[PDB]
Amino acid sequence: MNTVPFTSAPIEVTIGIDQYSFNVKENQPFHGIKDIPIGHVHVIHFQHADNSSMRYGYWFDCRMGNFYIQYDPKDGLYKMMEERDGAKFENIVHNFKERQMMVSYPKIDEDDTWYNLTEFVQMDKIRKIVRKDENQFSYVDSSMTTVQENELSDPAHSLNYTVINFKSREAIRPGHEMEDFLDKSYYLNTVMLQGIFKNSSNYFGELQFAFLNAMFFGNYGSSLQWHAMIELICSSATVPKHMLDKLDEILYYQIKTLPEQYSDILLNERVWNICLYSSFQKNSLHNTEKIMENKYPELL
Amino acid sequence: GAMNSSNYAELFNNDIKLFVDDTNVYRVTVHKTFEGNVATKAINGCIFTLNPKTGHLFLKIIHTSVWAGQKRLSQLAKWKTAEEVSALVRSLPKEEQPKQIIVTRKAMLDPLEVHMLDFPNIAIRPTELRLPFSAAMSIDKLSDVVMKATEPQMVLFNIYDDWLDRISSYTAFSRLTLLLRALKTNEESAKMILLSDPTITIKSYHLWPSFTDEQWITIESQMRDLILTEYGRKYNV
Numbered sequence: 001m002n003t004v005p006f007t008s009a010p011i012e013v014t015i016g017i018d019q020y021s022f023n024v025k026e027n028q029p030f031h032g033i034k035d036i037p038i039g040h041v042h043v044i045h046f047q048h049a050d051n052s053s054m055r056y057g058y059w060f061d062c063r064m065g066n067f068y069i070q071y072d073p074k075d076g077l078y079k080m081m082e083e084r085d086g087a088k089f090e091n092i093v094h095n096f097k098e099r100q101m102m103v104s105y106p107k108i109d110e111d112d113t114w115y116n117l118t119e120f121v122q123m124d125k126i127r128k129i130v131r132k133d134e135n136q137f138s139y140v141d142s143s144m145t146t147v148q149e150n151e152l153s154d155p156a157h158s159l160n161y162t163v164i165n166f167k168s169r170e171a172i173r174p175g176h177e178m179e180d181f182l183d184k185s186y187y188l189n190t191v192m193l194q195g196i197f198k199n200s201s202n203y204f205g206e207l208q209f210a211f212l213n214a215m216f217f218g219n220y221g222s223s224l225q226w227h228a229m230i231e232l233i234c235s236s237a238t239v240p241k242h243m244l245d246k247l248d249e250i251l252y253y254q255i256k257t258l259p260e261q262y263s264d265i266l267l268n269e270r271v272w273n274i275c276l277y278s279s280f281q282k283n284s285l286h287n288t289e290k291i292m293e294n295k296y297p298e299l300l
Numbered sequence: 301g302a303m304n305s306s307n308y309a310e311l312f313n314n315d316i317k318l319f320v321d322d323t324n325v326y327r328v329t330v331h332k333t334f335e336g337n338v339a340t341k342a343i344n345g346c347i348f349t350l351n352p353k354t355g356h357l358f359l360k361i362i363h364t365s366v367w368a369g370q371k372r373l374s375q376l377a378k379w380k381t382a383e384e385v386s387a388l389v390r391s392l393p394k395e396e397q398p399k400q401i402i403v404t405r406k407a408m409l410d411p412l413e414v415h416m417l418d419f420p421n422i423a424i425r426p427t428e429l430r431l432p433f434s435a436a437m438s439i440d441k442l443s444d445v446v447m448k449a450t451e452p453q454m455v456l457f458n459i460y461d462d463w464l465d466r467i468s469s470y471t472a473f474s475r476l477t478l479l480l481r482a483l484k485t486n487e488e489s490a491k492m493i494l495l496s497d498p499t500i501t502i503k504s505y506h507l508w509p510s511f512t513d514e515q516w517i518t519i520e521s522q523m524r525d526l527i528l529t530e531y532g533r534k535y536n537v
């Protein structure tokens with residue numbers, strides 16, 4: 001039901017909307033995307049035809065405002081903007097729909113892929129990882145570094161993922177060195193779940209957001225965060241049964257959706273081999289283990 | 301990064317550093333049971349922690365009681381090693397704490413790093429050097445204090461005796477590594493070479509015999525011959 005109109009499309013670009021994508025020609029009469037499902041976060045993303053280095057996009061939730069895209073010929077990108085005049089916006093969207101100048105969000109009725117990838121992902125949590133408080137939507141690109149990457153530069157353009165470091169005082173209680181390093185349960189359950197995330201839903205939301213930024217932007221720091229959050233659960237002997245069953249579902253859909261041809265740059269051999277075959281949870285991820293063994297046996 | 305042939309002189313500079321060798325921490329005899337199964341019996345071990353510049357040896361004796369009721373002892377032994385090295389560093393005055401700890405076995409890196417998180421400026425390093433410190437228990441006085449221990453104990457030695465009065469740390473370490481390599485390759489032969497002339501004794505306060513400079517050259521020769529004699533007997537040519 002929701003719509004993200006475009007003022008125009010002056011430069012040739014591949015436009016992504018969640019897991020879908022389509023090519024727009026230079027000066028093609030393209031005026032946006034309609035029938036966007038209410039109830040989920042969405043990501044609109046861009047790769048310029050003349051420069052694939054320009055790979056960037058916007059997380060948004062149409063419940064939080066009227067958003068549109070307009071090309072900026074000075075900064076050389078498609079920008080998301082908020083229209084505060086509801087009647088002007090409704091009038092623009094009605095005209096473009098009447099003239100059929102919009103692509104329809106192409107959801108198959110049977111298909112829960114997007115829900116399954118974004119089940120725990122909330123815009124309010126996105127806006128804490130990506131700090132730009134004057135906008136209700138969040139810009140991400142291929143080059144943005146994480147707070148953790150910046151510790152090992154510009155802080156305002158960083159991804160504020162929760163720092164996970166297995167060889168840190170936060171991860172290891174004085175006097176429990178071997179126990180805490182070989183069994184990460186205290187770090188997962190006390191420090192991360194009880195301490196920082198408050199519940200498993202926020203932990204999964206960050207994990208899901210990190211995977212989506214990895215997949216949609218090739219964001220290397222996001223890929224690191226996704227694998228660290230998997231490894232922290234798999235490396236804990238004590239995990240609530242509901243979290244294990246949910247993680248198996250989460251990872252199954254992530255592995256299902258990953259483009260076959262990016263498996264080599266998006267998946268860390270060491271982490272997946274450790275997680276599926278060595279870890280405490282080696283026998284807890286039945287669905288994930290089966291799709292990985294059938295889709296990516298080379299990695300394993 | 302790794303300590304190798306290319307950065308060897310760094311051992312003898314004025315930055316305090318320790319080698320840690322864990323190969324004698326967990327020691328066992330393997331034997332048959334009454335039912336014809338196999339079992340192990342632990343014997344006392346030791347951490348070999350050495351300042352290569354000064355010769356100071358911090359020999360932490362690991363008493364078999366440490367292992368009682370514990371599982372996965374070869375894994376625990378690395379963590380117990382790291383715990384005791386960490387405790388030794390914390391026991392030293394700040395001006396005596398090492399800048400670097402070099403582990404002889406790469407499996408010691410994570411255990412030691414995790415125990416030393418409170419010391420972020422102490423570098424934990426591996427080495428490409430194949431050092432013969434496993435042969436420490438072929439030094440009679442070191443084996444004797446380890447085997448006689450009835451409780452955990454730390455015993456201090458200077459593994460160079462008084463050699464630094466006459467030679468540099470580089471030459472002292474070279475002599476030690478040659479002696480331990482000989483003891484490791486053919487213990488009986490090495491001991492015979494060291495102890496054959498009864499007129500040259502070991503001082504009460506020393507580990508090795510009281511060789512004159514000329515006698516050390518002959519001994520060093522006899523040790524190099526042994527290592528090549530044994531390398532001949534091994535490979536046939």
Ligand SMILES: O=C(NC[C@H]1CCCO1)NC1CCCC1
Nearest residue numbers: 441456457458503504505506507
């Ligand atoms: O006790 C010292 N060294 C260790 C001994 C124990 C058995 C063999 O070597 N030296 C002391 C003597 C005078 C000053 C320090």
